[model samples]
Structures are given as C-alpha cells and as structure tokens.
Target: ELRVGLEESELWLRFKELTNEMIVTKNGRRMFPVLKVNVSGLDPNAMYSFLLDFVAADNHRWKYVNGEWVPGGKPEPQAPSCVYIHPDSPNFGAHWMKAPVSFSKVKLTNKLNGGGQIMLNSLHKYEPRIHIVRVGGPQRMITSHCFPETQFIAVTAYQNEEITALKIKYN
Candidate 1:
C-alpha cells in the first residue's frame, strides 16, 4: 500500500516561519519551504527511478508590462527537466526516512546544473512533480502494477494571500 499525506516536516515549517518573518523583497528570495516525504511499502530489492518536472502556468511566455507581469510574448522554449534525488535517495525510502524527511534546507539556484536541484525565477509560477518507477525484473523492466506512480505538487513563491492564509491555518 502507498501512503501520501500533506504534513510539512519540522525543518520546512521553521523555514516557512523565517521566510514569512523576513518578507522577501524585490531582489527575489528562494523558497525555504519544501516537501519532505516518507515512502514505505516498497520492495527493498526493486530499483526505483524518479524525475522532477516543472510545468508552466499556461502555454504562453510571460513578460513584464507596465509594472505588471503578463503573458504576451513568444513561447519560451522548454528547458531540460531535472530530478532532485533526496540526498538519501540512494538508499531509497528505508534509509531516507530513517529519521525525519525534511527538504527545507534545499537551496534554489538560477544556474542550470546538470544535477537535480536548480534555482528558479522569483514570482514565476511552477509545479514540482515526483515520479517513481520500479525497474528490474522480467518483462523488460516495466513499471510495476503496484508501485506508486508520478505525484505532482504545486510550487510557487509565497505571494498569494489566500495561499499564505491556508498554509498558516493548515500548519
């Protein structure tokens, strides 16, 4: 069985509080809030593949217009997607979640690093998705019927008042 929940790790919670208190300004601030998850009920011997993808708000490019951000420009070519392996992912969930799962310390960088985890533009909306693929075994190594599939979670700067309120209440 697969388990999914909306609980933010303690580390992520602290980061959220700090960012909220500091108030990210025009210079653009990185997100301290991250999704920390614990995966269980997977076969230890099975090899799992994962990926992270970012989806645009719409099918158009955005531009700064009259002091406001608007979508009215040539479509920006899609960038290469990257997948961040939880530092402890090598050991899979068993080792990663031995303690507590916390991604709060993850840093964002604008430079596109071939490795997973890169910085993002501030104010731009994006989403984070996690795909888990179980490899190995016969049948040419296809996805297992019982394995958890790709999971998506929205990612955005803390600018929406409604979202902020919701986070506060949920936490």
Candidate 2:
C-alpha cells in the first residue's frame, strides 16, 4: 500500500474552503481551489497508469443559470473514456510530490477537437481519479492502485471569469 499525503499549503486549504461555498448560479464557478497532491511509494523503474474518472451524482445532473442551482437537463450519454496526462508525468512518485505541485494547472475544455485539453461539460460536476500501475519485470506480475477509490467532484467551464484569477493566485 502507498501513502498519499496532502501538502500543507494555503492553496489547498483555500480550495477546501471554496468547495464549501454554495455554487453560485448565473456565471460559471471555478474549482475555487484546486487539488495539488503528492504521492509516494512506488518503484522508480516500474511503469504506471494514471486514470481520472468523474463520479456519478445522485441524479447525475445539475445546472447553473440566473444565479441559482436549477435542473439544466439530464446528463448526455456518459462521456467517452479519456485521460489527461499532467504536462510533466511518468516521473518517480517520490520525486513528483517533492515541491508545491500544481494539478490546478489542468483545464477541462469543451471544444469538439478537445483543444488539446481536458474536456468537460459546463455546469456539470465531475470527480477526478488517479491510478498508479506498476509493470512487473520480464514475466513478473504487475500491481496497481486507484487512490481514494471514491471520486472527488469538480466542474468544467465554458467561460469562467474566476478561472484566470484563481490560476494567478495559486500559480
């Protein structure tokens, strides 16, 4: 089993606080705070698999408009399976979390081409999941672990004013 530690930083604490606030309607809302996780315990020589999945809500639907939480519509058919690779990935788990890492730098866009970015639906809540896979040597077996097991909810934006401000503050 690997141990995942939350880095002690204002950004992370702020993000938690922001998530507590009621998501305002009318304009899109940013993650308020973003997640920056540091992971340890993995073989440096082994290959790993990182996966992100959005958890299903009770109704699996939501909406924001006219400054209120209203029903937009049922979610479109589930999105195709996709994964966003951190710009700097495939690093030793020990080295990856050494400093104030910023996973907030990731964006979930909605362009048809994906705009070479993480795609998501506006007003829809999503959860990010991380998986670590280890490739065994030669004929040896492999190992993998999906942290938390439960999904962490988040939102994507079509156009969010706070996104720029939040990025500048956390970055």
Candidate 3:
C-alpha cells in the first residue's frame, strides 16, 4: 500500500505552534526544518520525480497586528504558483526506498523575477505540498501529501521574537 508521513512531525509542530514564520529574503531563503518525508510502496524499477510547491494557505493577507499575525485583507493574486523539484529526481524507487527522502535543497524566494526559486507572498500563510510523479509514467500514478500542522506564514522580517529566538536556539 502507498503511504507517507512527515518524518519530523514534532519539529514541524513546534514551528507551527510559533506560527511558523519563514523569513523571506529579497533573493531567497532556505526553509529551516525543510520538508522531510519517508515514502513507501512504489515499484522498485519505476523512476520517481519529487517536487515541492508553495500555495497560498488561506484566502487572506496577513499582517502583524499588535504583535501577531492576523488577516489584514484579501491577498494579492498570489505569486504565480511555483514548484521546486528535487535535484536528485527521477531516481529509481529502489534508491528512495533505501534512503530517507529529504528536500533540504529546496529554498523559498520572494524575488519577483527569479528563476528556480519558490516565490511567495510576504505576510501570507502558505502550505508546502510534496508531489511524487513517475518520470515516464503511463496512465496515472501521481500522489501528494500535505499537513495542516505544517502550514506557515512568510514574512520579510521576523514577526515573532520568540520564534526568531526559537529558531536561533535550534540552529
């Protein structure tokens, strides 16, 4: 049976509890505690490709009101949806089955005219989705996974000092 789960749910939860604010640098920023997953139940010979996509998590724009993030208003049309594929993609299922799936190379960027980076909206919440596709598939066999607890807000600057502190301490 096909099954998958966040490899570090507890870690993702801790960040989520802090509102999971990701610092959006003008160029790009690497996701702290990047999406890590364990995948199973794929044909060993099948070539699999992985992608990380960022989508507006909610329908509203957010702002730090009186010290925390709150819906400010309707968001802008959101950056054209972006996806970052894993570097070592198209690997045989046997390779993934033998190794822990990791996407530490995926980074988030707010650059309006950037290439190969996931553009996001500052002061907005986003959900990072993991997509698994077969390199040379036939009919259909795509699967994806997302976790509500992993949703996070992107900011140009730190919104919560405690969160910054937490990340600093962890890093």
Winning model by TM-score: 3
The TM-score measured for candidate 2 stands at 0.57
Tell how far residue 90 is off in model 2, in angstroms: 2.4
Local accuracy of candidate 2 as per-residue lDDT tens digits, 1-171 = 565554544554444333322132233233434445566665655555444434434344554455444544554665653565555655555555455334554454444342325555545555555554443446434333232322223344323334345546655
RMSD of each: 7.5, 6.1, 1.7
How many steric overlaps are in each model, in order? 1, 4, 0
**Residue 50: error of model 3 in Å?**
0.5
Which residue runs does candidate 2 get wrong by more than 4 Å? Answer: 8-34, 49-53, 56-60, 65-67, 72-77, 136-171
| lDDT of candidate 3 over 1-171, digit per residue (tens) | 867778778878899887988877767788777777888898899989887887787767888888878896555566545878888887898887776788887667677655766778777788888888887867557798876767889888887898888788777
Q: Model 1, range 1-171, lDDT digits (tens) per residue?
A: 645333454544443332231122333233434455566665656555543344433445444355344654555655544545545444454553344444453445545554444545433434445555554545323222211121212233344354466456645
* C-alpha RMSD in Å of predicted model 1 compared with the true structure: 7.5
Candidate 2 accuracy as lDDT: 0.45
Indicate which candidate wins on lDDT.
Answer: 3
Ranking by lDDT: 3, 2, 1
lDDT for position 155 in model 3: 84
Deviation (Å) of 46 in candidate 3: 0.8
**lDDT scores in order:** 0.43, 0.45, 0.79
